Design a protein around this ligand. Structure first.
Ligand SMILES: O=C(O)C[C@@H](SC/C=N/O)C(=O)O
Ligand SMILES: O=C(O)C[C@@H](SC/C=N\O)C(=O)O
Ligand SMILES: [Fe+2]
Ligand SMILES: [Fe+2]
Lengths: 327, 326
């Protein structure tokens, strides 16, 4: 009942700094113990981002524990420590580095060119699933990782809701959350729809799941960082590229799963997005349109979009390799 | 630098700790500056809660700035500093020390008993307003403070949503937020419904409103602390006490405003809770029912409830005093 709490995970990490983090998470942890943990985490991230593969794996695994564990008692300090890593990560990410604001037209055009160039729908694995050709074992690989992307997405969206101080924009994210959590029926929440689909093909849907795929950990860490960022451009970038790409991708995945012999009801997870999302996306765009004139927003948004695509592509690459290792 | 950002509010507080907090909220503030702010805030709260009236008012004003300002860039550090104060505050609150969990029936009975003993609806001001004897200006006093209670309640609910790790419990709070923010029409969010009522009776509904009433600040500080607490018994206590009391209170406030010459549409803010809340309260009860076997939950819940009633009563008393002066 605690496999995804912070302390059990930290005691299982053959990383020295895991003990310093654990001490920082104690109920009566001192300011010096917490700041010490912050210092070791920041140094570990700096070493990893400079090319040290062992330091890279260490800082990522610790950041996964800090940002996505489920013991709320340590969450505030965990997020405080996560911030020390985020500051390094962001100070290492290629910045959009506009000196002045792009036109709204050039902003949408640049947005459109990047989405066209790097969307998950064009990935060879995606066309492969669409192709029909995937074995059952290979669809299990795909859906096993779909679970990690879907099952706590609503929490990342809630972090963005919390940071939208304007009541009408919070209302927009609330409408998103309501839809995502099943409207009036929590049995129809989108994680539980995906769980039903997973159950139909022989897989478990574990609400305490802890990933051991490095590229997947990298993807979830980045998404939580972006949705929690104080400059909501980071979260709006990730939110909007998802809400924009989901319908076409889910339409083709839906068709592929019925072609794999599952029913309309089992694949409901994909079906509902095809119809639920497009109109709400049109309303959600105003939160972005409102901010276009601000170059600080443009730089946060475009930097976040580019980083999200880099980690998504490496994640999809690793899933594709795993898929092809089975038959 | 808007009126409800942290730095403009801090510059207006003639307190030395206000400058230390200001330095701690700077973009390149060091860990030493933040720990200094945290220490001096904790010491200020300790001095105020032991009986230093000026330190009491001072830490309460500072906590209002930390917990409820709207400059998101400092939000994470402000909440870190608020926690240093919360830790002190919770050591002074009378804590429920039950060693064994009440039965579900005994627990519900205790809640009902505490509500019948402490509900805001029994306050002399409430009865007086219900009587139809309130002046237009007196109703204005009432609604000015209604604004402060209503306009950001959804954010506190959202903090509880974030701390409910169970997908089904997050969903229950999401349904609450959806209802609270107007469902498909943000023009009908409940803050905007209250704004429509305030404007119908000559008042401005300011989404950057900053309270200057000490008891109102104490109320809002406590409610945000409770909804943000890592042990969700605190927030579930305040959430559930509010959801339980709102329907009957709002029906009578609605009738009283209609008696005073307000339209059905103008007073919609109070009307919509009469029918929206009773259905939602029955589904929200399962969040409490599932945790009743846990005595730590019961103690957190009951301590929250008693503290909430304490700050709410002092707040209604202060509104009542203002209403009598007009
Ligand atoms: O990749 C992501 O982060 C988004 C997920 S889920 C979209 C909505 N799910 O309820 C996906 O794989 O489509
Ligand atoms: O006491 C409070 O803080 C609650 C508000 S109403 C909230 C309505 N629906 O959630 C009031 O002042 O009546
Ligand atoms: Fe969804
Ligand atoms: Fe409401």
């Amino acid at each position: 009942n605690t496999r995804n709490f912070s302390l059990p995970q930290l005691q299982n990490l053959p990383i020295e700094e895991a003990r310093i983090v654990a001490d920082a998470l104690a109920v009566h942890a001192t300011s010096r113990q917490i700041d010490s943990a912050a210092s070791k985490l920041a140094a570990l991230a700096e070493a990893g981002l400079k090319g040290d593969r062992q330091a890279y794996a260490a800082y990522q695994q610790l950041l996964y524990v800090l940002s996505l564990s489920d013991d709320v008692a340590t969450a505030q300090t965990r997020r405080w420590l996560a911030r020390a890593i985020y500051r390094v990560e962001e100070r290492f990410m290629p910045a959009a580095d506009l000196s002045r604001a792009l036109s709204e037209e050039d902003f949408q055009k640049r947005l459109e060119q990047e989405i066209a160039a790097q969307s998950r729908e064009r990935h060879p694995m995606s066309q492969y699933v669409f192709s029909g050709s995937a074995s059952r074992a290979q669809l299990q690989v795909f859906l096993r990782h779909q679970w990690f992307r879907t099952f706590r997405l609503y929490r990342d969206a809630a972090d963005l809701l919390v940071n939208l101080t304007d009541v009408d924009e919070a209302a927009a994210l609330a409408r998103y959350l309501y839809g995502e959590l099943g409207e009036e029926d929590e049995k129809g929440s989108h994680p539980r729809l995906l769980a039903k689909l997973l159950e139909a093909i022989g897989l478990e849907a574990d609400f305490q799941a802890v990933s051991t795929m490095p590229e997947e950990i990298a993807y979830l860490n980045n998404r939580a960082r972006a949705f929690r960022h104080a400059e909501v451009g980071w979260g709006l970038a990730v939110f909007y590229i998802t809400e924009l790409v989901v319908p076409g991708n889910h339409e083709k995945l839906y068709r592929a799963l019925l072609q794999a012999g599952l029913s309309e009801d089992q694949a409901e997870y994909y079906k509902v997005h095809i119809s639920l999302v497009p109109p709400r996306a049109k309303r959600e765009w105003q939160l972005i349109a409102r901010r276009i004139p601000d170059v600080q927003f443009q730089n946060a948004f475009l930097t976040s979009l580019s980083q999200h695509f880099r980690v998504e592509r490496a994640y999809y690459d690793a899933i594709w390799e795993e898929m092809q290792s089975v038959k």
